[PDB]
């Protein structure tokens, strides 16, 4: 039953490694588990709830370490689906990958803790919380969107910081004397940060007419400037999603891909990797060894380069390049028609 063995192995690799659809369900559950433990840990910091929270946390940590260990083992087992991660050496190389190393390290640390370590318990919780990404996908996406909007974000933060400084200084001047909230400029800066960010604790607020007038004038501006970065980033995220949708609907790379696969197989067949390769040689000789190899490698090169050129179809460039080609072809067609009709008339 090797077929069923490999089918189940590939299915397990798919569900554990990059999941597509309902596989996420499993991951969600795992997350919940970890999350639950984290919450329990918080409840154990409170003295009143220490008993029950720790009682539940012991069981939950046993359960989560069991689950993580079995997941790690079955993941290293399912790694055989990938040809690179095959056998002793392949699976050891998989385990060498840094994130699997971190996983096993956290597992062993938790097992040792269960065999003043509560601080290490929560630290392991946050580490396995960071572990859920495994790719930096969230970090990479945030970084790309921030970099694309770096100038706008910097404008927002810079002007908001200037507004905060100015408003804090002016309200401080207004309120330094007759308001114990604004005793020093540091207190005014704290108030301005808590106000323009819209947090507004209420521990400090202007109480004079000067302070309230200046705060009213500066609030309408500062709150907007401090809320700007969130709006910029959200709109950027939405626009990026829209453009990705358009591009994925405009992949239009089937022909280059098929040509690439054809030429790659041809190059392998011409290559001496296997001594049983003779059918390709018969096919090439029927259409009339090293020269055949060279021409086939050349065809593979051109197919690869065409695939690379077509590997960047974006929403707006596609139509523009298509119309450029169309209009130059139109001009060539009209000039050719003029030449041909002139030749006809010459008769």
């Amino acid at each position: 039953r090797n077929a069923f063995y490999r089918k189940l192995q590939n299915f397990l690799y798919n569900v554990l490694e990059r999941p597509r659809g309902w596989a996420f369900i499993y991951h969600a559950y795992v997350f919940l588990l970890v999350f639950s433990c984290l919450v329990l840990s918080v409840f154990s910091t409170i003295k009143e709830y220490e008993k029950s929270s720790e009682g539940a946390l012991y069981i939950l940590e046993i359960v989560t370490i069991v689950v993580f260990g079995v997941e790690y083992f079955v993941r290293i087992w399912a790694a055989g689906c990938c040809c690179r991660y095959r056998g002793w050496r392949g699976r050891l190389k998989f385990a060498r990958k840094p994130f699997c190393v971190i996983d096993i390290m956290v597992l062993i640390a938790s097992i040792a803790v269960l065999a003043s370590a509560l601080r290490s318990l929560r630290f392991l919780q946050i580490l396995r919380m960071i572990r859920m990404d495994r790719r930096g996908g969230t970090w990479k996406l945030l970084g790309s969107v921030v970099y694309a909007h770096s100038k706008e974000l910097v404008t927002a933060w810079y002007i908001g910081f200037l507004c905060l400084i100015l408003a804090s200084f002016l309200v401080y001047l207004a309120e330094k004397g007759e308001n114990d909230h604004f005793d020093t400029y540091a207190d005014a800066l704290w108030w301005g940060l808590i106000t323009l960010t819209t947090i507004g604790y209420g521990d400090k607020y202007p109480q004079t007419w000067n302070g309230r007038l200046l705060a009213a004038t500066f609030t309408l501006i500062g709150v907007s400037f401090f809320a700007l970065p969130a709006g910029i980033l959200g709109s950027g995220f939405a626009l990026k999603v829209q453009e990705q949708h358009r591009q994925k609907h405009f992949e239009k790379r089937r022909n280059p891909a098929a040509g690439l696969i054809q030429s790659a197989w041809r190059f392998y067949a011409t290559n001496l990797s296997r001594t049983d390769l003779h059918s390709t040689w018969q096919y090439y000789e029927r259409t009339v060894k090293v020269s055949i190899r060279a021409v086939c490698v050349m065809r593979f090169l051109v197919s690869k380069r065409k695939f690379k050129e077509s590997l960047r179809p974006y929403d707006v460039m596609d139509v523009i390049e298509q119309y450029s080609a169309g209009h130059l072809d139109m001009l060539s067609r009209i000039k050719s028609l003029q030449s041909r009709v002139d030749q006809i008339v010459g008769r």
Binding site: N10, N14, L260, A264, V290
Partner: protein, 143 residues
């Protein structure tokens, strides 16, 4: 090895026609025509751009030797072929039917014969059950 170097030198000499110490565009054209395919000047300029790197206009012997010394391991095309098979992975799970492989192989671009695509499916799919794993095929060989 020296034997393979001599074989590649003979290949270059056969490629060379006038004997200028290099391979010119017209030599490429005549060898393509001898193979049976009719080349194009656009195709010839594509060849020159592909191989030549010093921008002289021809292909020399050391470049040919170095280029043939590189196998799939020395091309870093793993992602390229991965995406090439991905484009035709309609579902994205990682399975493509043998019948569709035969259809695409022998009717698109540089088409091959039915027997050659059957051989390709057999080699790519170790189990030979009609379901080819693209990552399997592109990792066993291309990697």
């Amino acid at each position: 090895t020296e034997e393979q170097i001599a074989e590649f030198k003979e290949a270059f000499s056969l490629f060379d026609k006038d004997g200028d110490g290099t391979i010119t565009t017209k030599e490429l054209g005549t060898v393509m025509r001898s193979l049976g395919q009719n080349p194009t000047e656009a195709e010839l300029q594509d060849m020159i751009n592909e191989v030549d790197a010093d921008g002289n206009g021809t292909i020399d012997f050391p470049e040919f030797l170095t280029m043939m010394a590189r196998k799939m391991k020395d091309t870093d095309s793993e992602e390229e072929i991965r995406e090439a098979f991905r484009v035709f992975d309609k579902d994205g799970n990682g399975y493509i039917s043998a019948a569709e492989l035969r259809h695409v192989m022998t009717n698109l671009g540089e088409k091959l014969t039915d027997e050659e695509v059957d051989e390709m499916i057999r080699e790519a799919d170790i189990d030979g059950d009609g379901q080819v794993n693209y990552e399997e095929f592109v990792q066993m060989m291309t990697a």
